[PDB]
Amino acid sequence: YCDSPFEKLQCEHLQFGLQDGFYSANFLDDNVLPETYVALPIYYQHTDI
Amino acid sequence: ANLSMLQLGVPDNSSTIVTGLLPTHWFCANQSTSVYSANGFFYIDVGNHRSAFALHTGYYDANQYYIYVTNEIGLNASVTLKICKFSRNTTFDFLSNASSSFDCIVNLLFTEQLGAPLGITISGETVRLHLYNVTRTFYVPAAYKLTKLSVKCYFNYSCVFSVVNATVTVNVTTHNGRVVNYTVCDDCNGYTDNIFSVQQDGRIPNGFPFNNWFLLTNGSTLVDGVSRLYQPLRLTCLWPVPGLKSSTGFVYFNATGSDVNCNGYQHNSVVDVMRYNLNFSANSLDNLKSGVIVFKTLQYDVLFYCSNSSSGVLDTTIPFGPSSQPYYCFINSTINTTHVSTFVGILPPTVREIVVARTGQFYINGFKYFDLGFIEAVNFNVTTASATDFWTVAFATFVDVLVNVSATNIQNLL
Amino acid sequence: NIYDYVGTGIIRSSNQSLAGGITYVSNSGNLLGFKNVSTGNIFIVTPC
Ligand SMILES: *[C@@H]1O[C@H](CO)[C@@H](O[C@@H]2O[C@H](CO)[C@@H](O[C@@H]3O[C@H](CO[C@H]4O[C@H](CO)[C@@H](O)[C@H](O)[C@@H]4O[C@@H]4O[C@H](CO)[C@@H](O[C@@H]5O[C@H](CO)[C@H](O)[C@H](O)[C@H]5O)[C@H](O)[C@H]4NC(C)=O)[C@@H](O)[C@H](O[C@H]4O[C@H](CO)[C@@H](O)[C@H](O)[C@@H]4O[C@@H]4O[C@H](CO)[C@@H](O[C@@H]5O[C@H](CO)[C@H](O)[C@H](O)[C@H]5O)[C@H](O)[C@H]4NC(C)=O)[C@@H]3O)[C@H](O)[C@H]2NC(C)=O)[C@H](O)[C@H]1NC(C)=O
Ligand SMILES: *[C@@H]1O[C@H](CO)[C@@H](O[C@@H]2O[C@H](CO)[C@@H](O[C@@H]3O[C@H](CO[C@H]4O[C@H](CO)[C@@H](O)[C@H](O)[C@@H]4O[C@H]4O[C@H](CO)[C@@H](O)[C@H](O)[C@@H]4O)[C@@H](O)[C@H](O[C@H]4O[C@H](CO)[C@@H](O)[C@H](O[C@H]5O[C@H](CO)[C@@H](O)[C@H](O)[C@@H]5O)[C@@H]4O[C@H]4O[C@H](CO)[C@@H](O)[C@H](O)[C@@H]4O[C@H]4O[C@H](CO)[C@@H](O)[C@H](O)[C@@H]4O)[C@@H]3O)[C@H](O)[C@H]2NC(C)=O)[C@H](O)[C@H]1NC(C)=O
Ligand SMILES: *[C@@H]1O[C@H](CO)[C@@H](O[C@@H]2O[C@H](CO)[C@@H](O[C@@H]3O[C@H](CO[C@H]4O[C@H](CO)[C@@H](O)[C@H](O)[C@@H]4O)[C@@H](O)[C@H](O[C@H]4O[C@H](CO[C@H]5O[C@H](CO)[C@@H](O)[C@H](O)[C@@H]5O)[C@@H](O)[C@H](O[C@H]5O[C@H](CO)[C@@H](O)[C@H](O)[C@@H]5O)[C@@H]4O)[C@@H]3O)[C@H](O)[C@H]2NC(C)=O)[C@H](O)[C@H]1NC(C)=O
Ligand SMILES: *[C@@H]1O[C@H](CO)[C@@H](O[C@@H]2O[C@H](CO)[C@@H](O[C@@H]3O[C@H](CO[C@H]4O[C@H](CO)[C@@H](O)[C@H](O)[C@@H]4O)[C@@H](O)[C@H](O[C@H]4O[C@H](CO[C@H]5O[C@H](CO)[C@@H](O)[C@H](O)[C@@H]5O)[C@@H](O)[C@H](O[C@H]5O[C@H](CO)[C@@H](O)[C@H](O)[C@@H]5O)[C@@H]4O)[C@@H]3O)[C@H](O)[C@H]2NC(C)=O)[C@H](O)[C@H]1NC(C)=O
Ligand SMILES: *[C@@H]1O[C@H](CO)[C@@H](O[C@@H]2O[C@H](CO)[C@@H](O[C@@H]3O[C@H](CO[C@H]4O[C@H](CO)[C@@H](O)[C@H](O)[C@@H]4O)[C@@H](O)[C@H](O[C@H]4O[C@H](CO[C@H]5O[C@H](CO)[C@@H](O)[C@H](O)[C@@H]5O)[C@@H](O)[C@H](O[C@H]5O[C@H](CO)[C@@H](O)[C@H](O)[C@@H]5O)[C@@H]4O)[C@@H]3O)[C@H](O)[C@H]2NC(C)=O)[C@H](O)[C@H]1NC(C)=O
Ligand SMILES: *[C@@H]1O[C@H](CO)[C@@H](O[C@@H]2O[C@H](CO)[C@@H](O[C@@H]3O[C@H](CO[C@H]4O[C@H](CO[C@H]5O[C@H](CO)[C@@H](O)[C@H](O)[C@@H]5O)[C@@H](O)[C@H](O[C@H]5O[C@H](CO)[C@@H](O)[C@H](O)[C@@H]5O)[C@@H]4O)[C@@H](O)[C@H](O[C@H]4O[C@H](CO)[C@@H](O)[C@H](O)[C@@H]4O)[C@@H]3O)[C@H](O)[C@H]2NC(C)=O)[C@H](O)[C@H]1NC(C)=O
Ligand SMILES: *[C@@H]1O[C@H](CO)[C@@H](O[C@@H]2O[C@H](CO)[C@@H](O[C@@H]3O[C@H](CO[C@H]4O[C@H](CO)[C@@H](O)[C@H](O)[C@@H]4O)[C@@H](O)[C@H](O[C@H]4O[C@H](CO)[C@@H](O)[C@H](O)[C@@H]4O)[C@@H]3O)[C@H](O)[C@H]2NC(C)=O)[C@H](O)[C@H]1NC(C)=O
């Protein structure tokens, strides 16, 4: 199971047990995010289909 | 200065409106030291003495370019211009302060006719050089910091010099190849940003802040970066303060009529565009002009107008400058008593420039809206109580250029 | 989605004195900061 802080390194490197030395780690997280929109000036006009 | 024609760019037997960095007032001083703030200088030397001028900032820097000009006594004008960095330096002195020159863009020696003034001016990162017969240009980086000016010359040795702050508008009259008069508008407000004088070969003068000169495009819009392009930026005439009225008529794509008063040089050819220019104020009380635009196609006329309602039947207006509510625009035409109308689009939030090509295309703010087949003349019917609607009306032709775009504007031109 | 640039990151306000463009990109196509056109304030964009 990939839950523990050390159980995630193996789960990321696809390996059962790891050697000694330095390793690179960066754990992302999938979620939902708000959205922003900035554009050059123009007026607003809408339609529905 | 009461100086040569080519140093100003005016033809024979005419009276133009020249704008830019120009010298106004001479000095006669003997204090031998005074630190000024300026952007250029003019001087005349005929005396037998050592005279030198120099431009510098307020503090030492080892990565800065310092201009330095030194005249030398002879039979002609011996001039030594040097533009480069300096090591441990000087307090001040004539005749080559310090030979610490190690990476110099320009290091020359001039021998020109005695009795002719010289000058150096700075605009952005561009350094000009007037020489009474030619106008050179160098591109030295980080040259907008050079604000101070350390002038050192004496009056008894036949030495008078002027100095420039900024952007003076003048009125120069020429006759038989010599300038006759030189007067400065205390009136004539706003002329410094919309009026210039066309140089030789139909070029556009350097150091002109492009106010409402947009980049024409068929697709997307450029935002930043240097981009080689192909734009109509070579004039054949210019009509300053036209004062178009409601009873003028048509204009026929050539400046050989009876009402055209070109400014500066004026060739004769056939043009491709007609760049208009709109004069508007910040307030929005009388920026709502009632009128139409009448084209002239080979078969039938086309009528263009805009309104603020979806059913464009009860109004006919064209706004200038900023607005507050959307406006819709239409097109009218007739084919055997059959009035046909269609919807074209919506004006941008601020209308400032209008361009009409000759092959049919019609641009607003540098964006195509529709396209006719072939246009012969344009009648800009606007009802107004005075002559204040437009700044200039310029004819142009397509020419390959190189543009430094910043924030959807034009900085330089080459 | 800022001037036809897409990605992710945190947008914070700041106050710097810069005149010129309204988009400062790196040499690898990523944004580093834009500028509201109707004022002079800029903004900073960094990955999280
Ligand atoms: C800068 O750019 C400017 C814009 O281009 C430019 O200025 C303009 O340049 C144009 C290009 O050259 C130029 O156009 C030419 O104009 C000639 C002038 O003719 C008219 O004026 C003379 C008197 O000077 C007159 O005798 C003649 O009949 C023409 O009068 C016109 O009559 C029309 C009606 O018939 C009339 O239309 C109606 O008018 C009403 C009022 O009366 C009312 O307003 C109506 O609403 C309106 O529809 C029109 O208004 C009037 N025009 C004037 C000015 O009074 C044209 O002759 C010339 O066309 C001929 O030449 C071209 C080639 O150049 C040919 O291709 C073309 O087919 C024409 O050839 C024949 O021409 C004759 C007339 O000459 C026609 O009729 C014959 O007439 C004979 C007797 O005269 C005889 O009866 C015959 O049987 C008739 O058939 C004939 O049909 C034509 N075709 C054929 C196959 O034969 C051309 O259009 C324009 O004038 C310039 N000026 C402007 C626009 O103000 C400027 O030059 C540029 N700058 C520089 C430096 O270059
Ligand atoms: C958005 O997209 C749209 C898409 O359409 C774009 O619209 C197009 O825009 C282009 C750009 O203008 C249009 O293309 C043509 O441009 C010509 C410009 O002429 C220049 O440049 C060309 C390009 O290399 C040169 O080959 C020319 O020689 C000329 O060179 C210039 O520089 C030289 C440097 O030394 C000088 O020596 C020259 O003198 C010159 O200054 C125009 O001329 C084209 O117009 C032609 O067609 C018109 C309609 O057919 C004619 O009316 C017109 O005649 C004009 O000139 C005579 C001269 O007396 C006048 O009397 C007329 O009244 C009129 O004013 C031109 O006629 C040429 O073509 C016909 C038809 O082929 C020939 O029969 C003529 O003999 C004449 O010669 C040309 O063709 C012959 C071959 O037949 C060649 O041998 C000769 O060398 C000539 O090339 C035209 O405008 C293009 O048409 C536009 N699209 C459409 C659909 O119209 C927009 O621009 C885009 N927007 C943006 C912002 O980009
Ligand atoms: C404006 O900027 C200029 C820089 O461009 C500043 O310098 C002035 O530059 C002007 C020329 O652009 C100078 O004007 C000339 O002044 C000459 C002075 O010469 C006398 O003095 C010198 C010593 O200073 C001496 O060596 C010499 O021998 C003279 O004694 C004038 O000579 C000249 O005008 C005179 O000559 C013209 C035409 O003469 C030609 O033809 C003759 C044959 O007819 C021939 O013999 C000559 O050799 C020559 O080839 C003549 O038409 C003039 O007539 C005037 O007077 C009548 C009335 O009698 C009048 O109707 C007419 O319109 C003329 O006004 C005259 O006899 C030039 O004017 C000026 O001197 C320079 N200034 C200084 C201080 O040096 C200038 O300072 C700037 N000004 C300001 C206000 O900022
Ligand atoms: C800024 O201004 C000037 C810019 O040039 C600076 O230098 C001064 O320049 C003036 C004009 O040149 C000088 O005035 C005369 O200078 C003559 C020298 O000529 C030179 O230049 C000519 C070309 O023009 C050249 O050909 C020549 O070879 C030289 O190189 C002097 O000769 C002349 O002296 C005359 O006057 C004296 C009397 O003057 C004294 O006494 C007065 C009271 O009586 C008093 O008011 C005066 O102020 C002064 O103290 C006269 O004795 C001389 O005649 C003698 O010689 C003849 C033979 O030639 C003999 O026959 C006779 O019996 C006498 O024995 C002569 O007629 C002028 O001085 C001025 O001198 C320059 N200044 C200095 C300090 O030298 C000026 O310095 C600058 N200002 C500052 C503050 O720095
Ligand atoms: C600004 O104004 C100043 C003056 O304030 C102008 O300076 C002078 O302007 C005068 C005319 O405006 C010039 O006179 C001209 O002289 C020419 C002859 O010069 C020849 O020889 C000299 C050497 O001595 C040489 O350097 C030069 O290049 C020439 O080869 C004449 O050509 C000219 O007009 C003559 O021709 C016209 C007809 O012109 C038509 O036909 C031409 C083809 O032949 C064609 O190219 C033209 O475009 C045009 O379509 C003719 O009508 C003239 O007749 C005159 O004389 C009769 C009496 O016989 C009289 O009735 C009539 O009314 C005319 O007065 C003439 O034969 C000029 O005469 C003078 O040279 C200028 N001086 C200087 C120093 O420049 C200055 O030019 C103006 N600025 C500009 C940009 O023009
Ligand atoms: C780009 O657009 C901008 C838009 O603002 C424009 O800026 C303005 O430009 C004008 C220059 O034209 C600036 O100057 C103003 O001029 C006013 C002129 O007043 C005289 O004329 C009045 C009417 O004349 C018009 O109408 C007649 C027909 O009636 C027509 O023939 C004329 O040609 C002209 O079109 C007239 O009312 C007035 O006095 C009359 O009435 C009295 C009775 O009251 C009578 O006794 C008189 O005999 C006479 O008949 C006068 O004769 C001037 O009034 C105005 O002054 C106001 O503003 C100044 C400055 O703010 C104040 O100090 C002052 O107290 C007034 O409130 C002003 O001087 C004008 O200032 C510009 N606007 C701004 C905001 O700067 C640009 O010029 C355009 N660019 C180009 C190139 O055109
Ligand atoms: C000959 O060559 C020199 C360069 O080699 C050209 O330009 C000079 O460049 C130097 C730097 O390389 C400039 O040096 C400056 O000196 C100032 C001293 O100014 C004196 O004069 C003013 C008024 O005339 C007095 O107020 C002042 O007290 C001095 O007596 C310094 O003020 C500058 O740095 C110091 O001040 C700044 C603040 O401005 C501090 O921040 C610094 O830490 C430091 O304390 C600066 O170093 C020099 O001004 C330039 N001009 C001249 C004439 O030397 C010359 O143009 C070139 N040609 C000639 C004819 O000299």
Coordinates of N, CA, C and O in Angstrom, one line a residue, chain A residues 40-45, chain B residues 323-326 346 349:
Chain A
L40 N -7.3 40.7 -24.0 CA -7.3 42.0 -24.4 C -8.8 42.6 -24.4 O -9.7 41.8 -24.6
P41 N -9.0 43.9 -24.2 CA -10.3 44.4 -24.0 C -11.2 44.1 -25.2 O -10.9 44.2 -26.4
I42 N -12.5 43.7 -24.9 CA -13.5 43.5 -25.9 C -14.9 43.5 -25.1 O -14.9 43.3 -23.9
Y43 N -15.9 43.7 -25.9 CA -17.3 43.7 -25.2 C -17.8 42.3 -25.1 O -17.2 41.3 -25.6
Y44 N -18.9 42.1 -24.5 CA -19.5 40.8 -24.1 C -20.8 40.6 -24.8 O -21.7 41.5 -24.8
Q45 N -20.9 39.4 -25.5 CA -22.2 39.1 -26.1 C -22.3 37.6 -26.2 O -21.3 36.9 -26.5
Chain B
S323 N -16.2 55.0 -25.0 CA -17.7 54.9 -25.0 C -18.1 54.1 -23.8 O -17.3 53.6 -23.0
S324 N -19.4 53.9 -23.6 CA -19.9 53.2 -22.4 C -20.9 52.1 -22.7 O -21.1 51.2 -21.8
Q325 N -21.4 51.9 -23.9 CA -22.4 50.9 -24.2 C -22.0 50.3 -25.6 O -21.4 51.0 -26.4
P326 N -22.4 49.1 -25.9 CA -22.1 48.5 -27.2 C -22.8 49.2 -28.3 O -23.9 49.8 -28.2
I346 N -19.3 44.7 -34.1 CA -19.3 45.7 -33.0 C -18.0 46.4 -32.9 O -17.0 45.9 -33.0
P349 N -14.0 49.1 -27.8 CA -14.3 50.1 -26.8 C -13.8 51.5 -27.1 O -14.4 52.4 -26.6

